[PDB]
Amino acid sequence: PLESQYQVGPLLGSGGFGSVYSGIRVSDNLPVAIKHVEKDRISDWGELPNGTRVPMEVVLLKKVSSGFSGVIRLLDWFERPDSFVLILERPEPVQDLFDFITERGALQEELARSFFWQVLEAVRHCHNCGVLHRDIKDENILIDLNRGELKLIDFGSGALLKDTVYTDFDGTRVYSPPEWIRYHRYHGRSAAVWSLGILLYDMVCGDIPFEHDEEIIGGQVFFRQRVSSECQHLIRWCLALRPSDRPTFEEIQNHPWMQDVLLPQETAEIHLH
Amino acid sequence: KRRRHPSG
Ligand SMILES: Nc1nc2ccc(Br)cc2o1
């Protein structure tokens, strides 16, 4: 009984991911988000341990929702005749990182460092859980404004993580790496690192660096805002044209620009209240 | 101008 277990509120957003409503769990007034996905519009399907055929998104969310982390957790899900319904955490108050950057402009590097660090820890958690997000971008990151915590959303273009080549891609083209543009092939970790370079530039410059294929493959990063030399180096490293030239997650987090990160509560108190 | 980019 989904209609008699959650109170359904206003529409929060819609798009390629589906339609998402604000909601409240009747059992305990817990704020939730209710995401509807049309069966007829589902690209990749998966299978649960029960054998039931569910969208890949549900499989991936179950794999990463164990415990606490910087991923929005799947609390429950339901199957309907023509759709699946997902019950997700809802931070309140919340703003997605795309809107946050639109309103604030380029972020101070101390704030970008804290946000970027938290995204790295969240992506590490996904990979440790066998999950590749494949659509890391500011639009798919929520900010819990009171806690200063970032949360990954929209695993609908993701995949099980593997070490062999990927030849399919459903994420955002302007965050996708040049080997995808040129050859329609990529490996998961180095492609993730590329999208993280795009995201970090986005944070410290106020918008993404590339809009067209020729810029993505061209391999030149122009900085439109004042950005420290250490931060420029990290970005350009993540945006290396050759995938094997890109840093690992460990090399990113050991980079000099990443040291002395703020705690999330400090981030909220200094930058978000 | 700054804009969102749909997925897919
Ligand atoms: N796409 C999408 N997944 C969400 C989960 C929670 C909240 Br709040 C908003 C969301 O938007």
CATH number at residue A88: 3.30.200.20
| Ligand 1 centroid from CA A154, angstroms | 7
Interface contact A98-B4, CB threshold 8 A: yes
Q: Is A72 in the pocket of ligand 1 (CB under 6 A)?
A: yes
Please say which residue of A72, A92, A112 terminates a domain: A92
CB contact under 8 A, B7 and A174: no
Ligand 1 atom at shortest distance from the alpha carbon of A94? 8
Question: What's the resolution in A?
Answer: 2.0
Domain with A56 in it: 1-92
Q: Residue A114: which of A269, A227, A223 has the closest Cα?
A: A269
Catalytic, out of A135, A144, A154, A202: A135
3-state helix, strand, coil in chain B (%, to 5): 0, 0, 100
Cα R_g (chain B), whole angstroms = 7
DSSP state, residue A46: E
Integer angstrom CA distances of residue A135 from A84, A145, A226, A232, A242: 21, 22, 27, 23, 20
Domain CATH code at residue A127: 1.10.510.10
A20 lines ligand 1 (CB under 6 A): yes
Backbone angles phi, psi at A26, to 5 degrees: -60, -35
Are A69 and A97 in the same domain?
no
**Residues of A annotated in the binding site, as ranges?**
12-20, 35, 89, 96
Q: Write phi, then psi, for A175 (nearest 5 degrees).
A: -100, 0
Method by which the coordinates were obtained: X-ray
How many Å lie between the alpha carbon of A263 and the closest alpha carbon of chain B?
A: 29
Q: Count of alpha carbons within 13 Å of A213, Cβ hemisphere only? A: 6
Taking residue A222's Cβ as centre, other Cβ atoms within 10 Å add up to: 8
Decide whether any atom of ligand 1 lies within 6 Å of the A16 Cβ: no
> What's the burial of A267, exposed, middle or buried (CB within 10 Å: 0-12/13-18/19+)?
buried
Q: Which residues of chain A are within 8 Å of residue B4 when distances are taken between CB atoms?
A: 98, 139
Judge if A49 and A12 occupy the same domain: yes
Minimal Cβ distance to B8: which of A139, A170, A206 = A170
Of A92, A127, A154, which residue constitutes the final position of a domain? A92
* CA atoms lying within 13 Å on the CB side of residue A111: 21
Contact B8 A16 (CB under 8 A): yes
Query: Into how many domains does chain A fold?
Result: 2
Whether A59 and A97 share a structural domain: no
| β-pair partners for A152 | A71, A141
> Pseudo-torsion of CA A159, A163, A167, A173, nearest 10°?
60
